[PDB]
Amino acid sequence: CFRNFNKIFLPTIYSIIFLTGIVGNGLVILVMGYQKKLRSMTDKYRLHLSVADLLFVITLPFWAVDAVANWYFGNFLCKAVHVIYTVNLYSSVWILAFISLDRYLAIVHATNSQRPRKLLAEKVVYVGVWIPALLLTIPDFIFANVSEADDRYICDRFYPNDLWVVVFQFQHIMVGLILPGIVILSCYCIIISKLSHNIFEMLRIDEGLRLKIYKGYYTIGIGHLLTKSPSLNAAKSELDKAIGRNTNGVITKDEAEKLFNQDVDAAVRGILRNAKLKPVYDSLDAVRRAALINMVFQMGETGVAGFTNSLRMLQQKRWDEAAVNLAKSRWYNQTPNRAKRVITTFRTGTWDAYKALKPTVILILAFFACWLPYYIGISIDSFILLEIIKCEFENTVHKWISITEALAFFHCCLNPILYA
Amino acid sequence: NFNKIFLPTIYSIIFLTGIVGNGLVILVMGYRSMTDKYRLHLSVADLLFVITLPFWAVDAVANWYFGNFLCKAVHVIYTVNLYSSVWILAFISLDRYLAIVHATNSQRPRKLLAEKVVYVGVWIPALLLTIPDFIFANVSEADDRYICDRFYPNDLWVVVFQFQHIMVGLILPGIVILSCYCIIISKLSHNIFEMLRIDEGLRLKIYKDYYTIGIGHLLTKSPSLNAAKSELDKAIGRNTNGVITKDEAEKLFNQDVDAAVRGILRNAKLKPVYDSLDAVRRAALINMVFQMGETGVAGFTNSLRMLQQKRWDEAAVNLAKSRWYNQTPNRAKRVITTFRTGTWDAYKALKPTVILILAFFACWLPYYIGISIDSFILLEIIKQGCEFENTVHKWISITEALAFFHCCLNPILYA
Ligand SMILES: CC1(C)CN2C(CS/C(=N\C3CCCCC3)NC3CCCCC3)=CSC2=N1
Ligand SMILES: CC1(C)CN2C(CS/C(=N\C3CCCCC3)NC3CCCCC3)=CSC2=N1
């Protein structure tokens, strides 16, 4: 086979990203870099991400000049462009891994374990993400050179065997996607598990945990209504029907968690069906979502849906207005302290009655979305390389790899785009 | 040629030691400590591999006689064993981290991890990684002998799998093991801070008799604050002005503990006692050195005897008879309880885990040196020619079989 339809259209893509990326990241480093005021730890990591992108976007006119006609830059700049691309390739994804780590420490070890969150943001990021990637750039400092093949000069990495190619193109999948990707997905699974337990701890304080059958109808665990029927043996049959064994009126703390988690999912599925509740729950955050779930566990789907003004105020982020409006209700004088805690939870968004993770989820997912078509492409090239699929299809796939790598560069002008 | 005599030698020993060894381990807990239950998973993994070792010997001595199907089966059993063994040890490290660092926070997810996660994470992904070996291993009908091994389409397929092997087999499990150990070593070294914090007290200002900072750290014996600040400024390098941070106090405490351990390990009476003691009981001995000092603690000749003899109830009652106990009861009562129980109750086994993991990696270490050199020549960095190239290939052959002893170090671990 042999190695240009998208080569005068492709340089416009580097230019769009250079113009958006330089202006975008430039004003972020202008705002963040010289400011002292409102700094959640993720903003410090975002500055590291913005500086990494800014350094790399400066390299884009070179990519565009190389794509249009030639490489007039020389030996040193061929190495520099290649080293700046590698540092931005590894640091970016690893900054998101350190951002995901920060979230794990913020949700799981909030008070349980003092911050190492300060150390990762102030010092570790330099020698744990910056320096390794700055040293991983060494094979590109010498193997990347200027070729004077035809009157047209080609600047790229010239290794010696191919067996040197796959060992580095595996190092790229490992350090670039496998190692940081695991960290991010681990945090995203540990959090949602130990965050849907805070709902247990919130409702244990409010509804109460009873391991034996109590009443005013027959009840078990975190307020699980078994039957309205005036018969204890009928309550046993309803208990054994949805738990497994013939328990006989007594359950345990660990197995009580499961029963409650089933009622949480049933209420969540119900909220996602209610015309009034569905948009509000989708608008709210984890803690404020749990405060609304708490209300469904007490009033019910219809009971919550009734609070027209407050639900609209919760949907529109008007916290103090929603809390004041909710205080002027039937519920606030029915259960003064349970409503006091829930209202103040809706007011602040914290567990202070006993930290936003949502923009982080968007940032990582958008980065994953940017690089996804390139990963879809690169795999097919590796599939044809191993002789799994079969020359016209080979060079046409290479074409999409060129455009997807350039469309993936949009990840640079996104961290600044996130501030909407 | 010598490998026709030396490989069956290494196979025979490892077969007998491995079959009699792992066999016992299975039948013991075939009908409960969670660090053992994984050790049972290892015996099922290792015994299956030892069961295939006569095939290795027959095919090293003479011919492959066992057909195409059994060629694939030996390749799969080897692959399963390669990935399960190392990943069980990762889960062993993971369990200890949850047992030491999250002793209460994450109480029993270990009960699930050892019952459920082990099959979805160690067994299933290893048995699904057995697929390339199931396809590519076949019997080559060669001229004078039949050869059993994997034959891939191109040299690229070789690289893809022979590097995948280093990730899910060495980099990924090793990265888990090392990080777990790094956090355990940090939590138990933290834990001693909390002990002395309850006993010698923590503060960021000074006191006198004797100017002191942090957790009973004597700045100067001289009655001059200028010298107390001068000692403090130089203790943590940076300018202090007489004040330090809680996190900064740990740095001074670790310096005080490590220097005390450097004292104990350079003392003939205390070194055999400290080496024999566990993490919790080691901290209790250190606590005593912070109160009495080397010479003072080394004086309890009768007490130090039972501490290194695993007779706790005998040592505790003997120590309550000393001058030290009645003169200072509260602290001494709490330290005696530490030796007696091995728990932090006054304020989980770790050594077999560490030995098992170090012994496993030591077993595999020479093979990794040999496989490292072979990859250096294949990639063209080293150059002596083909003479040392076969010497390296002779090394890999011997070191790979010599690294099967890993199957043996689980039942042998009961010593
Ligand atoms: C991975 C990589 C850095 C490698 N590469 C490549 C191959 S090198 C290269 N130019 C540049 C890539 C990035 C650094 C500067 C040279 N080739 C040609 C040169 C003539 C015009 C078309 C592209 C294209 S896009 C890309 N990205
Ligand atoms: C990684 C691997 C399984 C690959 N391999 C090999 C190559 S296959 C093989 N026999 C067996 C190894 C493992 C499965 C059964 C075939 N070769 C020869 C046949 C001629 C005499 C020496 C051994 C030897 S030891 C080893 N280790």
PDB file of C-alpha atoms in Angstrom, chain A residues 104 109 112 114 119 160-161 163-164 166-167 170 174 178-179 182 254 385-388, chain B residues 97 102 105 107 154-157 159-160 163-164 167 171-172 175 246 378-381:
ATOM      1  CA  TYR A 104     -12.910  10.436  46.063  1.00  0.00           C
ATOM      2  CA  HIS A 109     -12.895  10.731  53.246  1.00  0.00           C
ATOM      3  CA  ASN A 112     -12.867  10.537  58.203  1.00  0.00           C
ATOM      4  CA  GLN A 114      -7.692  14.637  56.768  1.00  0.00           C
ATOM      5  CA  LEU A 119      -0.581  17.737  48.984  1.00  0.00           C
ATOM      6  CA  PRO A 160      14.481   1.626  14.024  1.00  0.00           C
ATOM      7  CA  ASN A 161      12.555  -1.581  13.612  1.00  0.00           C
ATOM      8  CA  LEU A 163       9.245  -3.598  17.067  1.00  0.00           C
ATOM      9  CA  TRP A 164      10.240  -0.185  18.626  1.00  0.00           C
ATOM     10  CA  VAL A 166       4.449  -1.063  19.006  1.00  0.00           C
ATOM     11  CA  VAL A 167       6.373  -0.946  22.382  1.00  0.00           C
ATOM     12  CA  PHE A 170       1.445   0.264  23.875  1.00  0.00           C
ATOM     13  CA  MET A 174      -1.017   2.099  29.098  1.00  0.00           C
ATOM     14  CA  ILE A 178      -5.291   2.293  30.857  1.00  0.00           C
ATOM     15  CA  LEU A 179      -3.534   3.675  34.006  1.00  0.00           C
ATOM     16  CA  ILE A 182      -8.836   3.004  35.753  1.00  0.00           C
ATOM     17  CA  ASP A 254     -26.333  -5.021  57.154  1.00  0.00           C
ATOM     18  CA  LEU A 385      -2.162  -4.280  11.054  1.00  0.00           C
ATOM     19  CA  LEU A 386      -2.772  -7.685  12.739  1.00  0.00           C
ATOM     20  CA  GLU A 387      -4.518  -8.812   9.455  1.00  0.00           C
ATOM     21  CA  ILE A 388      -8.125  -9.041  10.813  1.00  0.00           C
TER      22      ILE A 388
ATOM     23  CA  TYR B  97      -5.388  -2.478  53.153  1.00  0.00           C
ATOM     24  CA  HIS B 102     -10.357   1.023  56.908  1.00  0.00           C
ATOM     25  CA  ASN B 105     -15.032   2.777  57.695  1.00  0.00           C
ATOM     26  CA  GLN B 107     -15.823  -2.932  57.742  1.00  0.00           C
ATOM     27  CA  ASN B 154       2.900 -12.232  12.293  1.00  0.00           C
ATOM     28  CA  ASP B 155       5.554 -10.986  14.784  1.00  0.00           C
ATOM     29  CA  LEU B 156       3.114  -8.127  15.701  1.00  0.00           C
ATOM     30  CA  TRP B 157       0.638 -10.641  17.310  1.00  0.00           C
ATOM     31  CA  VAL B 159       4.390  -8.306  20.653  1.00  0.00           C
ATOM     32  CA  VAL B 160       0.659  -7.491  21.372  1.00  0.00           C
ATOM     33  CA  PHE B 163       3.308  -7.055  26.271  1.00  0.00           C
ATOM     34  CA  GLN B 164      -0.344  -7.619  27.414  1.00  0.00           C
ATOM     35  CA  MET B 167       0.439  -5.452  32.016  1.00  0.00           C
ATOM     36  CA  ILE B 171       2.446  -3.786  35.942  1.00  0.00           C
ATOM     37  CA  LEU B 172      -1.277  -3.746  36.956  1.00  0.00           C
ATOM     38  CA  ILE B 175       0.977  -1.287  40.974  1.00  0.00           C
ATOM     39  CA  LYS B 246      -0.303  19.175  63.345  1.00  0.00           C
ATOM     40  CA  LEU B 378      15.321  -8.081  20.242  1.00  0.00           C
ATOM     41  CA  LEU B 379      14.929  -4.248  20.325  1.00  0.00           C
ATOM     42  CA  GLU B 380      18.703  -3.836  19.549  1.00  0.00           C
ATOM     43  CA  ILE B 381      20.324  -2.040  22.535  1.00  0.00           C
TER      44      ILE B 381
END
